[PDB]
Amino acid sequence: GVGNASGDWHCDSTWSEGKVTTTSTRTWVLPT
Amino acid sequence: GVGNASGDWHCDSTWSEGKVTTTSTRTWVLPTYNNHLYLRLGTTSNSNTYNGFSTPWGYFDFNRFHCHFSPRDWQRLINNNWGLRPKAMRVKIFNIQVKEVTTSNGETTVANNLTSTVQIFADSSYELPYVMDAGQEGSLPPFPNDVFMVPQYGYCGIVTGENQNQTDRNAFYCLEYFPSQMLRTGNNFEMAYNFEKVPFHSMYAHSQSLDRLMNPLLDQYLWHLQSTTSGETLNQGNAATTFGKIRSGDFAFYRKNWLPGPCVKQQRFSKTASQNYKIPASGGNALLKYDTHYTLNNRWSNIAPGPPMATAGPSDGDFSNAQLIFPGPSVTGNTTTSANNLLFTSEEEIAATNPRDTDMFGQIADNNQNATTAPITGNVTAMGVLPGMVWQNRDIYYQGPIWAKIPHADGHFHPSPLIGGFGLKHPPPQIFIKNTPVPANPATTFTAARVDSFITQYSTGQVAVQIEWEIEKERSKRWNPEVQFTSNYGNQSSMLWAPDTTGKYTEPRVIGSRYLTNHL
Amino acid sequence: YKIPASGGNALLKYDTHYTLNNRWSNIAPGPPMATAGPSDGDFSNAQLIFPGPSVTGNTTTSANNLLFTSEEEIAATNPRDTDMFGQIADNNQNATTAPITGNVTAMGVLPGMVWQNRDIYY
Amino acid sequence: FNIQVKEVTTSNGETTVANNLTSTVQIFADSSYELPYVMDAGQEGSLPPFPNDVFMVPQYGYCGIVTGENQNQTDRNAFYCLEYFPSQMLRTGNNFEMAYNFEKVPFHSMYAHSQSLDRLMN
Amino acid sequence: YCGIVTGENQNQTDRNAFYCLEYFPSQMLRTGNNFEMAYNFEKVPFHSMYAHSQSLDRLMNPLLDQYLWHLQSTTSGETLNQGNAATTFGKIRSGDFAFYRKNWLPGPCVKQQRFSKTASQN
Amino acid sequence: SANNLLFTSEEEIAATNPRDTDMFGQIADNNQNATTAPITGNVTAMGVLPGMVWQNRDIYY
Amino acid sequence: FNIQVKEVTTSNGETTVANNLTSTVQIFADSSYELPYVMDAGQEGSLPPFPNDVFMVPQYG
Numbered sequence A: 001g002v003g004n005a006s007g008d009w010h011c012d013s014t015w016s017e018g019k020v021t022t023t024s025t026r027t028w029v030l031p032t
Numbered sequence B: 001g002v003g004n005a006s007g008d009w010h011c012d013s014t015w016s017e018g019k020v021t022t023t024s025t026r027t028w029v030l031p032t033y034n035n036h037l038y039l040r041l042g043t044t045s046n047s048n049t050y051n052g053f054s055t056p057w058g059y060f061d062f063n064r065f066h067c068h069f070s071p072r073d074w075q076r077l078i079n080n081n082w083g084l085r086p087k088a089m090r091v092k093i094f095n096i097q098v099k100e101v102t103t104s105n106g107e108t109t110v111a112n113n114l115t116s117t118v119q120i121f122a123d124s125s126y127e128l129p130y131v132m133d134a135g136q137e138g139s140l141p142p143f144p145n146d147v148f149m150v151p152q153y154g155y156c157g158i159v160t161g162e163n164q165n166q167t168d169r170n171a172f173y174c175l176e177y178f179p180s181q182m183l184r185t186g187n188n189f190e191m192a193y194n195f196e197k198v199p200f201h202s203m204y205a206h207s208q209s210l211d212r213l214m215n216p217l218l219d220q221y222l223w224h225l226q227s228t229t230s231g232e233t234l235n236q237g238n239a240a241t242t243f244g245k246i247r248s249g250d251f252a253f254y255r256k257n258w259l260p261g262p263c264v265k266q267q268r269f270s271k272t273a274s275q276n277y278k279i280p281a282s283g284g285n286a287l288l289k290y291d292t293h294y295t296l297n298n299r300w301s302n303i304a305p306g307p308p309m310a311t312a313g314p315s316d317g318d319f320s321n322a323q324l325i326f327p328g329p330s331v332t333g334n335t336t337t338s339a340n341n342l343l344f345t346s347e348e349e350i351a352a353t354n355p356r357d358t359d360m361f362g363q364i365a366d367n368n369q370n371a372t373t374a375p376i377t378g379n380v381t382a383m384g385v386l387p388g389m390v391w392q393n394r395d396i397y398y399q400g401p402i403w404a405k406i407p408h409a410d411g412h413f414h415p416s417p418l419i420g421g422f423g424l425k426h427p428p429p430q431i432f433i434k435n436t437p438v439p440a441n442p443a444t445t446f447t448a449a450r451v452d453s454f455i456t457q458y459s460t461g462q463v464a465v466q467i468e469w470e471i472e473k474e475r476s477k478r479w480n481p482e483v484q485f486t487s488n489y490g491n492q493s494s495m496l497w498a499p500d501t502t503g504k505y506t507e508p509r510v511i512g513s514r515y516l517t518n519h520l
Numbered sequence C: 001y002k003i004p005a006s007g008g009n010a011l012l013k014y015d016t017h018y019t020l021n022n023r024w025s026n027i028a029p030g031p032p033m034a035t036a037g038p039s040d041g042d043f044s045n046a047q048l049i050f051p052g053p054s055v056t057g058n059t060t061t062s063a064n065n066l067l068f069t070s071e072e073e074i075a076a077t078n079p080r081d082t083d084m085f086g087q088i089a090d091n092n093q094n095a096t097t098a099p100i101t102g103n104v105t106a107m108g109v110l111p112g113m114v115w116q117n118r119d120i121y122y
Numbered sequence D: 001f002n003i004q005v006k007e008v009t010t011s012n013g014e015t016t017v018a019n020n021l022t023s024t025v026q027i028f029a030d031s032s033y034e035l036p037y038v039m040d041a042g043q044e045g046s047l048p049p050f051p052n053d054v055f056m057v058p059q060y061g062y063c064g065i066v067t068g069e070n071q072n073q074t075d076r077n078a079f080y081c082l083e084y085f086p087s088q089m090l091r092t093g094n095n096f097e098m099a100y101n102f103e104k105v106p107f108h109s110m111y112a113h114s115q116s117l118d119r120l121m122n
Numbered sequence E: 001y002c003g004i005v006t007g008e009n010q011n012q013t014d015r016n017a018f019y020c021l022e023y024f025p026s027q028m029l030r031t032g033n034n035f036e037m038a039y040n041f042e043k044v045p046f047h048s049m050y051a052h053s054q055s056l057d058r059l060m061n062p063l064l065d066q067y068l069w070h071l072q073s074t075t076s077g078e079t080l081n082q083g084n085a086a087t088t089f090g091k092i093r094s095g096d097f098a099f100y101r102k103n104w105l106p107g108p109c110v111k112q113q114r115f116s117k118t119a120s121q122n
Numbered sequence F: 001s002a003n004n005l006l007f008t009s010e011e012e013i014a015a016t017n018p019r020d021t022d023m024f025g026q027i028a029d030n031n032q033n034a035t036t037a038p039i040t041g042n043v044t045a046m047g048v049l050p051g052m053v054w055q056n057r058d059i060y061y
Numbered sequence G: 001f002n003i004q005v006k007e008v009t010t011s012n013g014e015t016t017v018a019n020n021l022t023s024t025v026q027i028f029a030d031s032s033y034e035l036p037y038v039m040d041a042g043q044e045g046s047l048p049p050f051p052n053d054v055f056m057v058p059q060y061g
């Protein structure tokens, strides 16, 4: 719907003994 | 959906035999801070220098008591229960409305932008520096029908030396690095939290004075030496020493089981301008230097109301820095000449257990007396805690803070905010909020430079906070009627504790919580 | 030294006391501290005094008729009653200015302190 | 136990004493600690050490908070009336009993240190 | 091992004690014999291996100002003993941080003499 | 020469507690009055007080 | 029902009105009779008799 957001802004890094997982979000502009 | 409200406005207090639950709602406005960018901050001023950052984010703060208690409620609470302590909390933000401003020439137009997002996250992890806790504006307003502006979030960084500058140690925390929820109208946010077991705050005044708890009728079975010589003259008399069994009446001499207080002395000033010595606010001898302060890393930090101590009553002509000062209804600006327009908190009630702010802790023999050398007593001003001491904490106030976060350090002793309140290791989390950026029309050919042209927006909605307080009734066996706080206001042209003809609302007096009595 | 029991300079004023709400309350045997042995010729207010068999009335001239409790045993862990806690540099020494030590009389508890409590008595 | 209530005739010159069998003495102990505690400090009245010594029960009196150097009372001062508490009534042949459990408390140290704190090193 | 020393003079009191290691049962080994033992530490506070990135005195939000007021000056001017009599109060504003009432006091403390690594300065 | 020695240091602690050579702070050691000037006392020894927070000395390799 | 919240632009000379869809009007009725009752005596504000008459909600004092 128009009124509902379609995703949450999460940027994160989670570290493991063997693997690290990176996550980042950004806002963008698109011209014509 | 766009058409449906996402929460109802309920403000309420429900009272139980054991627990009272407060609930209040308010409407808020959120600007766009710093045109969307984090800014370094620092000034170097000698006894003030500081360094840090200002953020594009804003936060909700419900740290003042009056946020959750209507005057009457506060009354009900304090005239009936001995202690109280917060148990659990839950918050929710809703009816987000994002506005966009056209800003035509001369006239600025505002219209809803339905598809716009404001982002909220609260951090449990306490990874962001806590600031909600001390001495600051931004808490929801006391009166329900008052809209408020969400405070901007800015944090301080460790300053080394008297000069402000940063070391490698200084750190930068970027709010965008945390995952946060994104809302649009029709979206809502909610969270819950549970306070940790904490000592019930004492809402009573001692009906006994520490120094004398003994039975007036009997006399100790111990003896003390009363006089080295005869007569009442200091250096003359017959040599013999005399001992005497401590009898009823010579109470000041009774050996007791406990010592009254931890203590730091405070300078005292008189509300009557005339009485004080002349002291400037600036220069080599600005007041600051003469007011009790603690030297930290080369910087004077003036001690805030200090280790709880007794203080002159509110009406008294003399007042100390130890007491907290609140504006008072009548005062118009940031500054005022006569202190008759201010409100003073006072801890007379504490006097029964610990030392007075302006007076000393006591006096100690500072010397080994001898027939040829007279005895000298030293005046004690600062006294750290000693085995067997018992003291009372500073009282809480209707408009005083509620909790404060206990510093993450190896050692802390008897955590109780000094400003008053409950000390928590994990305090209600700061809830952050910010309006997502949006972009003005942007150039047709690509440019790497970060975009800087944004549409102007602001948002508004309501937040609702509910706290569940655990309280304990009195259960005293005192016979004579207690003191209780009742208004007692004289005939008023425009009644107190209420909005007035202008429509303004202001709190008349500062109110504590210790009206009920209890013995030691 | 000569000291009266009454008047402007009655003993009370010179014996370590704690000012509470404008009233001197003389400190009872205070925070546990070491004290002269019972036999010793000097005694402090810190020690507890008991009548003793021979004493007839409420008052007596010679303290040889009284009984004194003493905490010599405590000496191993904490400071002496009549002596001080220690002495601290009360100044920043310098080639042109000599070092000054301050005598410390009252000392609140500090991290790492260990002390013994006053003993119990029959 | 073995409550014996006596009544005194008090004739002229001579005072006579005789038992009144139907008379009541009332005892209650309060757990709730609602009455100000006084038993605790520095005072006569404890049972005598020697068993075969009869003793006089102490009279109960309590202190009130004094504000200032001058004695007078504030609203804060309170009055506790013992009759306001429920208490047991006895007559000869009636007895009273009660029990209590101390709370866990640090063992009192009944030893003297054989080492001096300052030097524990080898 | 060290023994408790009474006084400034070394000598022993009855209190001094002697511990003889042979009085304890111990294992006897020869080549080919070995000894082993285990132990469990007790729960203890994690040692802090970090440096504070904030200075205690200022934890507040630089941007806002307290809602409390303090008295700033008894008189006008910047000269210590001259000026107009009136006392002035002011709402603690952003910047006058040294004046912000805080919730905590920074440290337990004992002063220490200071010396300079350059021989000349002392 | 002390240039041949190694010194441990607790600069890091400075954020929370007082400096070794400097004092704890200064207290009003007097009751000011129009005829009598205010005197501040230098505090050298300070026992623990309610609301104090400090760091412990660091460990070393 | 059919709540319609309007927002007014109020340009110069001319005042414009347009719907603001996301706006909230709040209603509660109190059973508990905790608020002083006034509906009862002698006063204008009741719905108009004739059906096709729009009316202005009375202000509460």
Ligand SMILES: Nc1ncnc2c1ncn2[C@H]1C[C@H](O)[C@@H](COP(=O)(O)O)O1
Binding pocket: B198, B199, B413, B414, B415, B416, B417, B421, B422, B423, B424
């Ligand atoms: N407000 C507040 N928050 C957290 N901790 C507190 C507070 N007030 C006192 N204390 C602590 C101080 C000691 O650690 C402990 C003593 O328990 P006691 O039962 O008081 O003898 O209680």
